[PDB]
Amino acid sequence: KPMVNESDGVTHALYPQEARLRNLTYSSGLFVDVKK
């Protein structure tokens, strides 16, 4: 689900209303089980 990885803080569960105001990108993390 959407997140805001910002320095000087955790990673807030970002929301539309905020990303709009703050000029962020209402995106999210993409993770895959890389096997070596």
Partner 1 sequence: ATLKYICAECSSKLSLSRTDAVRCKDCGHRILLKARTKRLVQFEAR
- What CA–CA distance (Å, rounded) separates 23 from 7? 16
Q: Is 12 in the site for partner 1 (CB under 8 A)?
A: yes
Q: Is 8 in the site for partner 1 (CB under 8 A)?
A: yes
**One residue of 1, 16, 21, 29 binding partner 1 per CB under 8 A:** 21
Q: Is 18 in the site for partner 1 (CB under 8 A)?
A: yes
- What CA–CA distance (Å, rounded) separates 26 from 30? 13
3-class SS at 18? Answer: helix
Q: Residues in the site for partner 1, rule: CB under 8 A?
A: 8-9, 12, 18, 21-22
